[PDB]
Design a protein around this ligand. Structure first.
Ligand SMILES: N[C@@H](CCC(=O)N[C@@H](CS)C(=O)NCC(=O)O)C(=O)O
Ligand SMILES: N[C@@H](CCC(=O)N[C@@H](CS)C(=O)NCC(=O)O)C(=O)O
Lengths: 237, 236
């Protein structure tokens, strides 16, 4: 909850010892993966939020593509891509592992994650469509993707996606399900009983809900962000 | 080996000391697994599937009916090309294809992300109107390949993951291998380093195993776009 850094800001000091730095943004569902993984693993970390509409120019040294999340370790290593940063964290900090250890069981989770692979672009295309234009086309595509997730979970008959306890796969796909209310997409999940239950269950984990934003604040952030407002990334601070 | 199709006998249980791979001889996704099975000396039996006359029993092997699919002597079923490859490097640490430093592993997975759009683009190019395909697609491939060209220019190494052949190289190879057959050779005109990497990959023994000439590949596609039950076995 620290103000984002923007154009004309001082590039950060060296990473604190015993700490991993994450370049983030408070509303970014991709960055929330890393943050939730860092948190659920008790890894000591300093968060540096980035103003994605007023990016500090030195941030392109941290990531040529200019996207969060980004890891910076005490050694100066820079890791990019939310799924990759999480995998890097479950391997470079082999303490409380979020992936199972049996490669067959790990792969069985990665396969479940593939069922989610279309969902972020769909939600992004829904956010970036004409507001007063209610597109059934996008919403229908999400229903199909969510049906594969609904079906997938019914087959495993477990509480979570990767099994009975909370696994990496659950943090990986959660940020989008959490935003469905604010995005007024709750009808893409009407035909998904098992999914609603899993969502509720995720609301009770301390980590999956740590950075909960009321639906109201999130919609106003989107309004500012779609207008490329330099205040979007810090709205609500 | 001839593909298995509708009305065929489901295969016997996987021989011990052997891992089964459900494949298709022209499939670039399965080519990932096969090259990984090869370059790691893993003993494996290949079962090609007729993707235009799928045997009904293949859907118990994969509800989605896609290849590649792994089956081990224990009956474990692994799906998705990248997942089968990662599984193989983790159940068989003889000849490591990923580096062991997580940062360097991550640095290769990050490089792989530059490739993520390329397979769907190529599929869209293949399934477009034969006469007057689309320069629009070709432009998206040019932009996508620019990220790979620059990435290799930045690392200034012979391969993508460093100086020896890494998982990353086998992961993205099948599509560059087909650029000739697909007549996309102009999407790589402004990519000097890529051309070089391609030439080198044709000389790797694994990346060239069971070589398919551009004409044969072109004929397989033609039969495949017409849903021919003979596309998968064409050329045997
Ligand atoms: N594929 C990336 C996506 C990350 C991403 O798109 N982050 C957004 C914020 S949610 C961003 O940095 N936006 C800045 C931009 O697109 O210029 C991942 O998984 O890390
Ligand atoms: N994402 C999958 C894609 C596999 C795929 O599309 N395979 C094709 C052959 S190249 C297939 O099985 N086609 C059959 C069908 O689409 O019905 C992976 O990487 O394994």
């Amino acid at each position: 909850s620290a103000r984002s850094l923007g154009k004309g800001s001082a590039p950060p000091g060296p990473v604190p010892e015993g700490q991993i730095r994450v370049y983030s943004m408070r509303f970014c569902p991709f960055a929330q993966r890393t943050l939730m993984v860092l948190k659920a693993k008790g890894i000591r970390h300093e968060i540096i939020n980035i103003n994605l509409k007023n990016k500090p120019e030195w941030f392109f040294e941290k990531n040529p593509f200019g996207l969060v999340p980004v890891l910076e370790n005490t050694q100066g290593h820079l890791i990019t891509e939310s799924v990759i940063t999480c995998e890097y964290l479950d391997e470079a900090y082999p303490e409380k592992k979020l992936f199972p250890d049996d490669p067959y069981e790990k792969a069985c989770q990665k396969m479940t994650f593939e069922l989610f692979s279309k969902v972020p672009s769909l939600v992004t295309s829904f956010i970036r469509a004409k507001r007063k234009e209610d597109h059934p086309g996008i919403k229908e595509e999400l229903k199909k993707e969510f049906s594969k997730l609904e079906e997938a979970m019914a087959n495993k008959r477990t509480a979570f996606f990767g099994g009975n306890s909370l696994s990496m796969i659950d943090y990986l796909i959660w940020p989008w399900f959490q935003r469905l209310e604010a995005l007024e997409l709750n009808e893409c999940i009407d035909h998904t009983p098992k999914l609603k239950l899993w969502m509720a269950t995720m609301q009770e984990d301390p980590v999956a809900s740590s950075h909960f934003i009321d639906a109201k604040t999130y919609r106003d952030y989107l309004s500012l962000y779609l207008q490329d407002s330099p205040e979007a990334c810090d709205y609500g601070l």
